[PDB]
Design a protein around this nucleic acid. Structure first.
Lengths: 79, 59, 136, 49, 126
RNA sequence: GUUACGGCGGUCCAUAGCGGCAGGGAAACGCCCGGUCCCAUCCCGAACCCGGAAGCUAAGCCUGCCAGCGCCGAUGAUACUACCCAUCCGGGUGGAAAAGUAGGACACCGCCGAACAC
RNA sequence: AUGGCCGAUGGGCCCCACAGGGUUACUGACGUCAGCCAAACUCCGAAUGCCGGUAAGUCCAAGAGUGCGGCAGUGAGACGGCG
RNA sequence: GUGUAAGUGCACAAGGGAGCUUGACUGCGAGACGGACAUGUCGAGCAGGGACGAAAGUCGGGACUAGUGAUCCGGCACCUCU
């Protein structure tokens, strides 16, 4: 006999790249995702592939806003 | 406040966390005894390697 | 023999034979019942034979319930074939029966004939089981 | 022959190029579309057949 | 007894206005350096606030209520230009030159547009 | 400063909702009156917009009453579980610890403004 | 997907037309009461592990880690515990 | 319902409709993801010259992820190179 299956796609390495508290530079990829399981918030932008990137430095802060899970970047105050 | 921690069993068959916890306690051999505090850190180390150590509350 | 009208997935992993049953641990339908004490895949044939054994040991009078449906497929590769070349086709339909799960229930007047019928059923069944009561 | 072909939208006022794709079963060859060229600025581009 | 069955056009208007207000407010938001000039418009009056949505606080407000503008012998658009002038000069007093206009879920035209153009004239930037 | 209050926002966006049954119209919010003007309906001045102030709080909005429906929901226990002990017991230790249930939880906070007060 | 309850729906019967009716030995959807199941179901949701930070530990040593370069070999694994 | 598989998402709409349009751009790209290598991916932001919008702002193709083929070789157009 034979199987009509056997295929699979390449793993896309989606996920969260910078978790809560992680200090990140601007443009840093925080979240690789397909939709908006994580939404963009403060100083975070959404790319064409629904990827979340920091628009400014800071520490990643995961929050909520009207039920949506959000990703925010809180500034790191210099001494 | 102080604990005497004597290694009684071996690192052979022991996992990385356990071996390195013993190192972090200062133990390298069977029947090697090290004296530490009763802090949370050494308490956690002992919780990780209780099966490899015999503990005695000093005084 | 019981069987589902359809399943979304015809080829499924084997149901995990672990854990005590969390639901169906009691009667909720009748007076006397069969409780299981082992893990097992109970099949169509077993269920129907046990139901029949009850319905023959006692006749018109009383009612029987079957609190499990065998909606879990089990495949079988053809015989005289090598390993591989795909997963087998469904052959058996089973119900994963954890201990505690009540399988059969009945309501009949005389406890004697009821318990004896349930004993016939248990002997048709592949597992160690137990008579249980709605009362306790 | 493909329905959606290369097109090669070129420019009026200088015949340099931009390329994209457009279905052949549109009833024309003339995808007049504005674009920015190098060496000039926004002008109308057409598809040289 | 009595029991009306359909939601009134007032409820429809309110909820829809709020919907489209939130719609444009997805993009628009105010700051201390660029406040949100948010409008409310009834059939009788018009109101504006300057908001810093960071703290959810108002910096300067204006309205067609107070007598200095209610006394005009003109239309609601006249009241609107006066309100724009007032909120412009009050914002200048508060230390503002640049805002972002929140039309409150209304259509930009008539009274609201006149208010906005008046504030633009008086000095605010948008 | 006080409102049965009008806006703008916030909350691990439901302890906030829905549905009650009894209420309110000071300014305001509103319905509401008309389309001459900007503007508008893939038809409609319904809407959008504009000009208005005849009457009405009927509705929206707002206030009080609530465990009726939904939502929240511990504790303890259980399941599951990392490590460990244990020659099958998936047994047991010390740690973590649900879901479901049950007991019980019914909006709050801020800024501005309005009338009044002052 | 189990049993009840209701009862559309149809099948029959009787009023016997054709419609409209009641009535049912029957099927009986939908809904509802109770009990259940799922790797490709999830209102939920652990422990662990992972990422990061931080304070310490080890610290005459783990003979650690990272970077560069020379030299490799390996790229047939096995059993056991757990999933 | 989302052009089309499934999933993640989308009702705040990314779904439905209308108007205007061509950013389905040029030069670039801080920083990142992913990573044997080669591939691949996101990208704020600066300028140019534009579209829409009152403005803020958005637009470097499409809700996202597939829809493709290294190098060699050769072809075409343009270029103040040889």
């Amino acid at each position: 006999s034979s199987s009509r299956n056997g295929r699979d796609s390449a793993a896309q390495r989606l996920g969260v790249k910078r978790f809560g508290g992680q200090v990140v530079k601007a443009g840093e990829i925080l979240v690789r995702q397909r939709g908006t399981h994580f939404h963009p918030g403060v100083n975070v932008g959404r790319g064409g592939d629904d990827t979340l990137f920091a628009l400014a430095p800071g520490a990643v802060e995961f929050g909520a806003k009207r039920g949506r899970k959000t990703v925010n970047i809180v500034p790191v105050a210099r001494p | 406040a102080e604990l005497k921690i004597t290694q009684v069993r071996s690192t052979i068959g022991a996992r990385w966390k356990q071996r390195e916890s013993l190192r972090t306690l200062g133990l390298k051999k069977i029947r090697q005894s090290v004296v530490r505090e009763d802090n949370a850190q050494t308490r956690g180390l002992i919780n990780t390697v209780h099966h490899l150590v015999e503990v005695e509350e000093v005084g | 023999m019981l069987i589902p009208r359809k399943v979304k997935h015809r080829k499924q992993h084997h149901p995990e034979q672990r854990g005590i049953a969390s639901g169906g641990t009691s009667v909720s339908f009748g007076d006397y019942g069969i409780q299981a004490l082992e893990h097992a895949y109970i099949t169509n044939r077993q269920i129907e034979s046990a139901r029949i054994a009850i319905n023959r040991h006692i006749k018109r009078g009383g009612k029987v319930w079957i609190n499990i449906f065998p909606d879990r497929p089990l495949t079988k590769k053809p015989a005289e074939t090598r390993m591989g070349s795909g997963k087998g086709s469904p052959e058996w339909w089973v119900a994963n029966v954890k201990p505690g799960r009540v399988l059969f229930e009945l309501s009949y007047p005389d406890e004697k004939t009821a318990r004896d019928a349930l004993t016939r059923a248990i002997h048709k069944l592949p597992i160690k089981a137990r008579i249980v009561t709605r009362e306790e | 022959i493909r329905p959606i072909v290369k097109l090669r939208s070129t420019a009026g006022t200088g015949y340099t190029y931009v390329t994209r794709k457009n279905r052949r079963n549109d009833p024309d060859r003339i995808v007049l579309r504005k674009y920015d060229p190098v060496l000039r600025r926004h002008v109308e581009f057409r598809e040289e057949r | 007894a009595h029991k009306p069955v359909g939601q009134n056009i007032s409820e429809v208007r309110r909820n829809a206005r709020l919907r489209r207000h939130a719609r444009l407010r997805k993009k628009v938001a105010g700051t201390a350096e660029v406040p949100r000039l948010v409008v409310n418009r009834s059939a009788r009056h018009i109101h504006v606030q300057l908001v810093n949505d960071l703290n959810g606080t108002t910096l300067a407000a204006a309205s067609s209520i107070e007598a200095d503008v209610r006394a005009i012998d003109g239309d609601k658009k006249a009241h609107s230009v006066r309100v724009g002038q007032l909120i412009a000069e009050r914002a200048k007093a508060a230390g503002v030159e640049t805002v972002v206009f929140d039309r409150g879920g209304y259509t930009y035209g008539g009274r609201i547009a006149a208010l906005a153009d008046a504030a633009r004239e008086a000095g605010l930037k948008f």
